[PDB]
Amino acid sequence: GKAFDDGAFTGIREINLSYNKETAIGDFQVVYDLNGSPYVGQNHVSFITGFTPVKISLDFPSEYIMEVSGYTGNVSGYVVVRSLTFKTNKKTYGPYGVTSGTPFNLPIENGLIVGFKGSIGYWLDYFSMYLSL
Amino acid sequence: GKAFDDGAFTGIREINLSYNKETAIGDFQVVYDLNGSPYVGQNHKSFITGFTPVKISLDFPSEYIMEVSGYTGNVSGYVVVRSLTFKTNKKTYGPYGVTSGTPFNLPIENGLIVGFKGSIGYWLDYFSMYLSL
Amino acid sequence: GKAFDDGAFTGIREINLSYNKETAIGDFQVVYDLNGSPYVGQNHKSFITGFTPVKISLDFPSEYIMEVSGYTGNVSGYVVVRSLTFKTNKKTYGPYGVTSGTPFNLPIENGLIVGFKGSIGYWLDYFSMYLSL
Amino acid sequence: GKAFDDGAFTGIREINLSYNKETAIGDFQVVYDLNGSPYVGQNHVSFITGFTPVKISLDFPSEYIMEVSGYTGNVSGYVVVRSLTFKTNKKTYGPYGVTSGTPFNLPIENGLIVGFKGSIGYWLDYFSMYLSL
Amino acid sequence: QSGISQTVIVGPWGAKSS
Amino acid sequence: QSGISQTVIVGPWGAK
Amino acid sequence: QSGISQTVIVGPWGAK
Amino acid sequence: QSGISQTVIVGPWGAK
Ligand SMILES: OC[C@H]1O[C@H](OC[C@H]2O[C@@H](O)[C@H](O)[C@@H](O)[C@@H]2O)[C@H](O)[C@@H](O)[C@H]1O
Ligand SMILES: OC[C@H]1O[C@H](OC[C@H]2O[C@@H](O)[C@H](O)[C@@H](O)[C@@H]2O)[C@H](O)[C@@H](O)[C@H]1O
Ligand SMILES: OC[C@H]1O[C@H](OC[C@H]2O[C@@H](O)[C@H](O)[C@@H](O)[C@@H]2O)[C@H](O)[C@@H](O)[C@H]1O
Numbered sequence: 001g002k003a004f005d006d007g008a009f010t011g012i013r014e015i016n017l018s019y020n021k022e023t024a025i026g027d028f029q030v031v032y033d034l035n036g037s038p039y040v041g042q043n044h045v046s047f048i049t050g051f052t053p054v055k056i057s058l059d060f061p062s063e064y065i066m067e068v069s070g071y072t073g074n075v076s077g078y079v080v081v082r083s084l085t086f087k088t089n090k091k092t093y094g095p096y097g098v099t100s101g102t103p104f105n106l107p108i109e110n111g112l113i114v115g116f117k118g119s120i121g122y123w124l125d126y127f128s129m130y131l132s133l
Numbered sequence: 134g135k136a137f138d139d140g141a142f143t144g145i146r147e148i149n150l151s152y153n154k155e156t157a158i159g160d161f162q163v164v165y166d167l168n169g170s171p172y173v174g175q176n177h178k179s180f181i182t183g184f185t186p187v188k189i190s191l192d193f194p195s196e197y198i199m200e201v202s203g204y205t206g207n208v209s210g211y212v213v214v215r216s217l218t219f220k221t222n223k224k225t226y227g228p229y230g231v232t233s234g235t236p237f238n239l240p241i242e243n244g245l246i247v248g249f250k251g252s253i254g255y256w257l258d259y260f261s262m263y264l265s266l
Numbered sequence: 267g268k269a270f271d272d273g274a275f276t277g278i279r280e281i282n283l284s285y286n287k288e289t290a291i292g293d294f295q296v297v298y299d300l301n302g303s304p305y306v307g308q309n310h311k312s313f314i315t316g317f318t319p320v321k322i323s324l325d326f327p328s329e330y331i332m333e334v335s336g337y338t339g340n341v342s343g344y345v346v347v348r349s350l351t352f353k354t355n356k357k358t359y360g361p362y363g364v365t366s367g368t369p370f371n372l373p374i375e376n377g378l379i380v381g382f383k384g385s386i387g388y389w390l391d392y393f394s395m396y397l398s399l
Numbered sequence: 400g401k402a403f404d405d406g407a408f409t410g411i412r413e414i415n416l417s418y419n420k421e422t423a424i425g426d427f428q429v430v431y432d433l434n435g436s437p438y439v440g441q442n443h444v445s446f447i448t449g450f451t452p453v454k455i456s457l458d459f460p461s462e463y464i465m466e467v468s469g470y471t472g473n474v475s476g477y478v479v480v481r482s483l484t485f486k487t488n489k490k491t492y493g494p495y496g497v498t499s500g501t502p503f504n505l506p507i508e509n510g511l512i513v514g515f516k517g518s519i520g521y522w523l524d525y526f527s528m529y530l531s532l
Numbered sequence: 533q534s535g536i537s538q539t540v541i542v543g544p545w546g547a548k549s550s
Numbered sequence: 551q552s553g554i555s556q557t558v559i560v561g562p563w564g565a566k
Numbered sequence: 567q568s569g570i571s572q573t574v575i576v577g578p579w580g581a582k
Numbered sequence: 583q584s585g586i587s588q589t590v591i592v593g594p595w596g597a598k
């Protein structure tokens with residue numbers, strides 16, 4: 001896929017992603033907060049289409065992500081992120097996608113997710129998260 | 134179980150833990166680095182015995198943990214940590230315990246594990262990690 | 267004066283300020299680095315004119331500030347920042363303004379200045395700096 | 400003089416120093432907090448004696464340093480720290496020593512002092528501070 | 533704030549706490 | 551805790 | 567060392 | 583990097 005690195009910001013205001021009930025996560029874009037002002041991250045799109053879009057508008061700054069979990073599995077000979085779930089101090093968003101394969105979860109006791117980086121070809125190949133206080 | 138919180142330090146020199154191939158992880162103790170000197174943390178022990186001891190001596194500071202993974206699962210009606218594996222930039226330690234249940238893993242791209250906290254009853258009920266630059 | 271708060275960024279690429287050889291520091295603006303891209307901060311201007319502009323262009327990221335110093339004094343009944351000097355690992359910029367009053371200086375052994383905040387009326391009333399690793 | 404480096408800790412519980420109103424600061428020792436427990440730092444003594452001891456006991460953790468200020472200047476041919484003052488969110492301790500020479504001050508809007516390093520011969524030659532969130 | 537230093541904490545893994 | 555990231559801030563210097 | 571600020575980064579999860 | 587933790591350090595004040 002085509003790699004991307006959003007970098008680190010002040011917080012997260014909204015997550016826009018798309019998925020397919022038969023494959024994995026497609027597109028991924030984040031609207032961060034930059035010192036009190038919304039900052040629209042670049043839109044990392046899949047090479048193909050046919051995905052179901054989802055918009056997660058957080059009630060920033062009172063609501064924030066406390067845990068990110070999901071599944072990585074095989075699709076067409078590729079290991080990709082098949083599903084994602086976001087739990088904030090107010091609600092749980094997801095799961096989105098297919099919960100098959102190998103699970104993983106990142107719960108946070110103290111600190112915030114302030115940025116994303118990864119790779120997307122047909123589907124989300126992999127991703128990392130920036131953490132800060 | 135009884136909760137513990139070692140706190141944060143400047144690095145990790147050695148880890149001592151015990152496990153049982155039929156249950157889960159039992160005792161947990163860490164020798165941290167505190168500004169260049171070894172600081173021996175308290176030994177957090179299981180309410181019972183019969184575990185196999187293991188000592189992880191790191192070649193500090195050139196050797197450090199890059200990823201922690203393991204398995205959580207049911208044992209006697211409780212959810213506990215059944216296995217742990219420590220991967221450094223020089224070697225892999227483990228897995229230690231029963232590799233059965235739900236897997237989890239925490240790869241670190243940039244940063245360091247500098248402390249532990251958790252709870253231990255008959256077995257390690259759960260644990261968290263302090264991360265810093 | 268009118269308070270401002272640029273917030274925190276990834277680094278500093280350029281500093282534009284103006285001064286008057288008889289009073290104090292006037293306008294203040296910074297071109298920060300945001301995850302590898304230049305980001306132009308709001309220009310914080312004096313309520314009056316007649317200042318001499320100064321552009322401090324840093325060779326980012328190999329060149330960075332190591333110490334900020336200056337003088338705070340009374341001007342027409344107000345305590346303001348009368349002078350500033352920036353020292354990087356490559357050279358010294360300044361002093362700019364009037365080197366008279368009470369001196370202050372902040373040397374950094376480890377870390378970076380990643381943001382500025384303050385207030386500007388006829389002159390720079392005061393300012394703080396954001397530090398990070 | 401003889402250089403020293405205490406390193407970084409969790410907070411400050413007590414500061415013990417000595418001075419001479421007609422010369423400069425002599426001895427310096429700190430009782431730090433290390434994850435909820437008191438940690439007695441090494442005592443950094445002056446090559447000579449005849450100073451006035453001072454104990455600064457802080458109501459930890461509700462009380463903490465917000466500003467450190469003082470003066471530097473000569474005593475014979477050497478440049479040293481002649482005076483120090485410690486302002487917390489509850490009281491002001493000092494000044495201690497010769498309040499003359501070149502002033503310096505470090506106010507803190509957000510963050511904490513968690514360590515000290517420096518040098519002491521007959522008097523405190525110089526010092527630095529560790530800052531953290 | 534208080535006078536206690538803080539750092540990022542990830543976890544916990546195992547029995548649920550929240 | 552809010553969803554706003556924090557960093558160390560030193561100052562201010564100048565008027566009070 | 568570098569004039570670039572840094573942050574803790576965890577991951578990646580997915581393809582190696 | 584190494585296995586040693588870092589912190590911001592301001593200073594020194596006094597002799598060079
Ligand atoms: O996102 C996973 C994967 O997507 C791209 O390749 C997958 C695509 O390759 C074609 O050659 C096959 O015919 C088709 O069946 C596959 O779906 C991307 O090029 C790859 O690196 C990886 O990101
Ligand atoms: O570590 C798991 C679990 O350990 C304790 O409970 C297990 C077991 O402890 C024995 O002392 C009792 O006789 C028996 O009735 C209990 O089932 C602990 O109490 C529990 O909270 C949990 O940590
Ligand atoms: O702390 C300042 C200074 O202390 C030592 O030097 C003190 C110096 O003072 C002279 O007036 C005396 O005659 C002589 O005996 C003493 O050595 C230290 O040597 C120096 O590096 C510096 O730290």
Ligand SMILES: OC[C@H]1O[C@H](OC[C@H]2O[C@H](O)[C@H](O)[C@@H](O)[C@@H]2O)[C@H](O)[C@@H](O)[C@H]1O
Nearest residue numbers: 267268313344346386387388389390391
């Ligand atoms: O920068 C110092 C100071 O500047 C301003 O005060 C100067 C004059 O500003 C206005 O013209 C006002 O009409 C006059 O009263 C005043 O003398 C500012 O208002 C101050 O708060 C302060 O920033």
